[PDB]
Design a protein around this ligand. Structure first.
Ligand SMILES: *[C@@H]1O[C@H](CO)[C@@H](O[C@@H]2O[C@H](CO)[C@@H](O[C@@H]3O[C@H](CO[C@H]4O[C@H](CO)[C@@H](O)[C@H](O)[C@@H]4O)[C@@H](O)[C@H](O[C@H]4O[C@H](CO)[C@@H](O)[C@H](O)[C@@H]4O)[C@@H]3O)[C@H](O)[C@H]2NC(C)=O)[C@H](O)[C@H]1NC(C)=O
Ligand SMILES: *[C@@H]1O[C@H](CO)[C@@H](O[C@@H]2O[C@H](CO)[C@@H](O)[C@H](O)[C@H]2NC(C)=O)[C@H](O)[C@H]1NC(C)=O
Ligand SMILES: *[C@@H]1O[C@H](CO)[C@@H](O[C@@H]2O[C@H](CO)[C@@H](O)[C@H](O)[C@H]2NC(C)=O)[C@H](O)[C@H]1NC(C)=O
Ligand SMILES: *[C@@H]1O[C@H](CO)[C@@H](O)[C@H](O)[C@H]1NC(C)=O
Ligand SMILES: *[C@@H]1O[C@H](CO)[C@@H](O)[C@H](O)[C@H]1NC(C)=O
Ligand SMILES: *[C@@H]1O[C@H](CO)[C@@H](O)[C@H](O)[C@H]1NC(C)=O
Lengths: 478, 170, 472, 144, 144, 475
């Protein structure tokens, strides 16, 4: 009946801790030696076979809002972007009055100036390059949004954020293509994966596994609709900090991939004007062919069902006997008001009014509408304005100019999630709930993937009472 | 696999008795990973302190500290030899008032430590380390025995082969 | 017969020089504010420091050759350098500065009472982020920040302009000094003298060790040590060579003297844009009468304080001695006039009413007591503001401080004095003189680090014993 | 009982029983024991992008890691890697301070005894290195 | 490192003479020695600060330490963390080599020896630690 | 029975790539004021280095496939990046320069010297820190660093000003090369091929090993190799593919040739303050007249050394082929003119005289005799001076050398050549046309890291034995 401490190295005991994660991406990118991605350049290779064990009989508590991974991932992507644009030309010298004459395409009225009118502004200006004593008059086919009327004059515009921020042009060579990034924990640490088929933002996650490396979390930054992300399993899942609270954002994860065909159907000849010693400012030379409106194609039926599905879950989350309004964003940052995301290296400010507009009766028919022909289903095209000057999402002092991508641009992203925002607005006799689209927080975008991951440390050493005792005998012979 | 698992299995379960194996595997996985990492750093050689570079560097240091600290304790406790090591320190009812069957067959390792954490320090950081210090002293204090050394020398004088000759006669 | 016995963990330490790290209090974290000294970067301070005492020990100390002083000298200046590194450079700001006597054209507020000239309302045509736009803008520069130019009664310019850059201090960063705990890496330790009186260099009977220094506020002050540590029931005087004059004389006080300092000016902030995403902050309008900055000091307290110091100095330079407290002869305003930072605002005070004392050796030394507060006018120190500040060891690299919106209130604790013995021929009359000193971040560091020294711990040890390695 | 360096003034004998106290804090350090911090910085976050202090803390860490390792490596060369108090077969030398064990362990403190042996130390270390060579050689003959 | 491998790799036998028992401890000894010399240097200058060379030395220090650990970790996996030359219970799968033990030790150099085994060398290591477990499981039955 | 036994420290290495740390005596750290290629960082070299000779060891060394050359190149470039990072930039100085008054006295001064206005009393309406006030100043700029504009016989600018940023190097920083010992970390080793002459790639008979490389000077030169190493008993020609014409021909000499070089002028070092805390450095008149920089080569020694190289070239392409040392083909001046740095000052020396010799195997030559020891033994190299150095790899990132005060004198040790074989139509004529080359600093490092090869150290080793783990078997 005598127990003595017996130290065991390798006991299966762990503790919720935080550690410096390291990136691990496929080596193929290193072999291609493109090294144009704003990350992955020095990112180590990934274990060909992911190593995961089943934590059976285990019940770990998981909290998305308290997942330090999201905070770290946020800092990582923020720095990676800064790192990439750190050594690239700035548009600080380009800060002059811009004589923005409308594109000669206005002379070609055709049909409402072809696709769009005033979207592109052939602006001219006086610049001082490496030669300071000598000034130079140059023209740049800038788009709208990037220009702001200044003197209230007809052809008097200026680069947006000329004084509010320092416009830095991202090096044209660099490529803004998110490639599967796998965050990995160092030895003595382990990412816990909420394996539960369905899991609310916070709470004990039953079905649970673990990984030493996150799945390929593409650092895709997109507003409202989450493109190219992790699809929900079987059931669309809505996650909020405080659903009843309005300020809080609402993370809706779609179970099915709504493929979106976005393209920039304009053949573009890119130009470059030298501004500063060994510094060249890239702009657009000419829009060869009729100027057409950039647009994205999405099956109404698919989206109609997707809005039907989410609506049901929103009803389950709140009052199943309440009305539900998908009103469009109530103003705010252009990114928040209109779906935005990167495609081919150009950010597409695309309208999403058509997407978020339909409403639903608590007792309305809940059937999945089928297609009624190519013309019947058609596609939800979106008026898109390309804003090259892109400001930081959480800082005003920093803004980045975007090099024009020469030639036709086209992408095929999968819609995998949607950020919404509940607004009670004193619903008359309640029985109503508005869910305008949300976005603008990169963290929110990262949570959509780390929703299951949870970093924990490991403690192999362990002591326990055992009838056995250390034998005081020391002499080998006696 | 890099993972011990078997956390849910309560202490004493065949898995908890076969932990040694999974631990030998893990200790090995550490090299399988370290060697892999080293091989790459030899090829890519992008150890440049980049955004990921610094991360990799911090990560490398953390792993070393983890391995070193756990081994240091083992060494001071006189347990550097193998994972499992019985010690001479008896358990106090204050540390726990449960039968071995309870503390084991009934408690999982995670659950167990949780209760002992309140005493974990006094158990090993103090008494256990002291035990070894006293043992070490007694060792050399017993190595000054003159007759023992002379008899021990006699053993090396024949290198304990005389007994083998007896076996040869047998 | 004996055999070497390897003893691991022997309690033996040796003087060493190593890098140290700061461990700021976790309360600073909670505040969630950007400190210039990166108090947030500093690791959390261990709740209770371990001050294990080394009994039966007599460790010698050398405060004048301590590495930590030099190491921190660099650490504090680097912290400032990296803090103001990414801030507006105020480079284009310098141009032609046409100025007026006061922001008030006449006695609009208090021209008569207001120190005429202290405003020097200078106007200038600066270029905004738009390269093709020039704008006339006005600003207020205390005489200490404007130099007459072209000998034009109204033409002036920034003081350290032409010579070096004057980057404005990033406005978000706070300059509130937070206690800092320099901690030794594992395998290293800091030894602390507990002796109630310590010369600074020599043996120590009460010696303790700490893995972490006590909290030290990195305050930079001249002719004075503010918010510093206190001696023990005795003012202590330390100098590498007391019989030498140049060697600045460090004094640690046993009693703290309160110093209330404030800016009685309600000021506003004007963000003149100078460059894309670069906003220069200046004072827009002062709301009300203009009152010069000052500091309140007790007569008796300061009197009693000097008395004790004077005695210590006679005990240092022969009993029979007359300690004459003179002021600084001349040199950089930094070391001529007592200067200190207050709520993100530099203050140059004329401590003439703190360093004016002859005191005959044969005089009443009875501790002066307060009889009537009305009669005991709290010494008021004439204080001004030098917004542009300059590095102490470097001619170039000057820095600007953005104005703070509103009146500022400070109340630090006098805790030390820096002095410079001058061997005037009058010494033949035993009239010892100790002019105020300063001008060296190191002198301030030596005052707070005298009791600490860092030693590497060597756990490896050998010893002879009758025990022998047995093969069997 | 005694603190980290509590046996500093204690005789070599008394201090010999407290060796573990120091050995326990050779690698154990506040920065290393931080693990997860109650601060936005997580495991030194990212060295705060190599801050003035981030470097210091990083550097200070490597010195604790290399130093402890160096000390172990030594004991490892001397064979008694895991052991704390070892027993060498190196015969003692009279020149190394002709003193009786009573004075050494009941009077001289480790700090004092070291200062004396400092003059002749590295030599002893080499004598152990070659003694293990002889030991390994002898053991090899037995293995054969 | 002064006498770093003072004697070059001869026939594994001639190399496995006193040379191995000595050079090994001398090599590891001088390795620590030169590492200790670096400690005095960085203590004397303290100029190593994220410089082209400062980053080089910092990464080099980390490399050496982690490469030392991997070697020692491996010794630990097959309970050989004590003696530099530890025997195992694993027999030699003739597939690894048919070479006469004499030749292996009389007409073969370590440099050549490892290559023909570079394929199995890793396979062997796994058997070495797997057996260590078999032996421990047996020790776990010897109840000692 | 055979039981595998683990052996620690088995003498086995493997070609590896490892980060190398510079090790210099740092004897210049005491002179903290003086900084050179980060001398302070370089940890002091071991006072007693020992080369362990690898007896009965043969190894292959690929002087070209040598990672060290690559690392040195990256470290050398990064060193310059760090040195120029905090230094000033001539961005605002790229103004229209009214370059006139080539020289004060176009009569007695330049007179016969081929000066023809090398320096120019160039004046320019540039601003200063005052910003508001704009002042015109005059500074002598070398015709080499200046480029004419509008051909108005007046408007001029800096050769790279419009297309490249010029960063003024900090004057306090010296550019004297110091011995840098590239030391490998523990667990790694640098093999040393000790054959008398090494083809550059192949099995090496004599092989040794070093913990650190021998002192290697960071010398950057073109068409020549200065303060370098010497060959063994014989000039050695080294190339990746000699029979290929493009591959640069690396030659290493067995003996050294003194190259007395000096700028024989007393120069006043005028400095111009432009921009807050920014000061440009230039020349304030030349004290006295202008003497053209020149280099002294032993006429006979050179004749002999060239003959030695020629004989080896015969041994490389058949004696039948005549060795024709032609002058540089053409291209950037850096390569066209043997250009090096003297005492922190960059030279540009015409090398036509040193490369104008046809060594026809069919012509008899009994070496050369310096009977006229006094005179007629100094091939005076017409040396020009340049201050604006362009990055050897990129178009941008140029650097200005602040003028040095007084006469700049030096004496290096020619220790080899960098040559270029030409695909001429005279291949049938058998006339190996070899012309001097340069512009690739990697070659400079190869010429010194040729005898080194970094390899990993794997101490752990396995070996079958007749012994078994019986000791631990019983527990
Ligand atoms: C570096 O050193 C070399 C060697 O000294 C100098 O060049 C050689 O100089 C010698 C004279 O000292 C030259 O000799 C002359 O060559 C003529 C050409 O024929 C050559 O080839 C035939 C092949 O059958 C040989 O038989 C013959 O000997 C030569 O090698 C000969 O026609 C000359 O013959 C005689 O007549 C002349 C006068 O016409 C006399 O001066 C001679 O003494 C002799 O009686 C003679 O042999 C030799 O050709 C040179 N070689 C080259 C490569 O040009 C370099 O000039 C020197 N460089 C410098 C810069 O100093
Ligand atoms: C065992 O060793 C013997 C000796 O090396 C091997 O026999 C040799 O086989 C090779 C290759 O075909 C021949 O070139 C030799 O002539 C053989 N020598 C002798 C002495 O017979 C044999 O193959 C080995 N067996 C295995 C399977 O390892
Ligand atoms: C230098 O020595 C190498 C050998 O180390 C010679 O290279 C071999 O030459 C033969 C015949 O010329 C070839 O078939 C081989 O392929 C070559 N390489 C090897 C590795 O054997 C070489 O000819 C010598 N000379 C030069 C200029 O390289
Ligand atoms: C102080 O000195 C004065 C003058 O001698 C004397 O009258 C008085 O009693 C003394 N005591 C006090 C008030 O300290
Ligand atoms: C530059 O321009 C100013 C203003 O016209 C003039 O005074 C000055 O002489 C000019 N300098 C040169 C070099 O022409
Ligand atoms: C070169 O060509 C000549 C022709 O005269 C021939 O005699 C000689 O052998 C060839 N090769 C050598 C070794 O020079």
């Amino acid at each position: 009946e005598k127990l003595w401490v017996t130290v065991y190295y390798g006991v299966p005991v762990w503790k919720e801790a935080t550690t410096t994660l390291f990136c691990a991406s496929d080596a193929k990118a290193y072999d291609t030696e493109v090294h144009n991605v704003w990350a992955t350049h020095a990112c180590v290779p990934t274990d060909p076979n992911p190593q995961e064990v089943v934590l059976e009989n285990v019940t770990e508590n998981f909290n998305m809002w308290k997942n330090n991974m999201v905070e770290q991932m946020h800092e990582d992507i923020i720095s990676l972007w800064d790192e990439s644009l750190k050594p690239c030309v700035k548009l600080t010298p380009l800060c002059v009055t811009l004589n923005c004459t409308d594109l000669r395409n206005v002379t070609n009225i055709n049909n409402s100036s072809e696709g769009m009118r005033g979207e592109i502004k052939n602006c001219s200006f006086n610049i001082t390059t490496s030669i300071r004593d000598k000034v130079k008059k140059d023209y740049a086919l800038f788009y709208r949004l990037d220009v702001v009327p200044i003197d209230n004059d007809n052809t008097s515009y200026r680069l947006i954020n000329c004084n509010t921020s320092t416009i830095t042009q991202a090096c044209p060579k660099v490529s803004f293509e998110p490639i599967p990034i796998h965050y990995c924990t160092p030895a003595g640490f382990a990412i816990l994966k909420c394996k539960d088929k369905k899991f609310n933002g916070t709470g004990p996650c039953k079905n649970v596994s673990t990984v030493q490396c996150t799945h390929g979390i593409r650092p895709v930054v997109s507003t409202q609709l989450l493109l190219n992300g992790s699809l929900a399993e079987e059931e669309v899942v809505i996650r909020s900090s405080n659903f009843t609270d309005n300020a809080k954002n609402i993370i809706v994860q779609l179970k099915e991939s709504v493929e979106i065909n976005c393209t920039r159907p304009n053949n573009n000849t890119r130009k470059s004007i030298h501004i500063g010693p060994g510094r060249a400012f890239y702009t657009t030379g000419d829009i060869i062919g009729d100027i057409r409106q950039a647009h994205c194609n999405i099956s109404r039926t698919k989206w109609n069902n997707t809005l039907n599905q989410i609506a049901t879950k929103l009803k389950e989350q709140f009052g199943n006997n309440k009305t539900i309004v998908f009103n469009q964003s109530s103003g705010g940052d252009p990114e928040i008001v209109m779906h935005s995301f990167n495609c081919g290296g150009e950010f597409f400010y695309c309208n999403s009014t058509q997407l978020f507009n339909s409403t639903w009766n608590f007792n309305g028919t809940w059937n999945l509408t089928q297609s009624n022909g190519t013309e019947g289903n058609d596609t939800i095209t979106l008026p898109c304005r390309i804003k090259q000057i892109i400001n930081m999402w959480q800082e005003v002092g920093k803004a980045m100019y975007a090099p024009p991508i020469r030639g036709q641009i086209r992408c095929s992203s999968n819609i995998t999630g949607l950020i919404l925002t509940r607004d009670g607005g004193n619903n008359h006799n309640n029985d109503t709930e508005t869910f305008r689209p949300g976005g603008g927080d990169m963290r929110d975008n990262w949570r959509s993937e780390l929703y299951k991951y949870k970093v924990v440390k490991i403690e192999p050493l362990g002591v326990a009472p055992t009838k056995a005792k250390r034998r005081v005998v020391q002499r080998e012979k006696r």
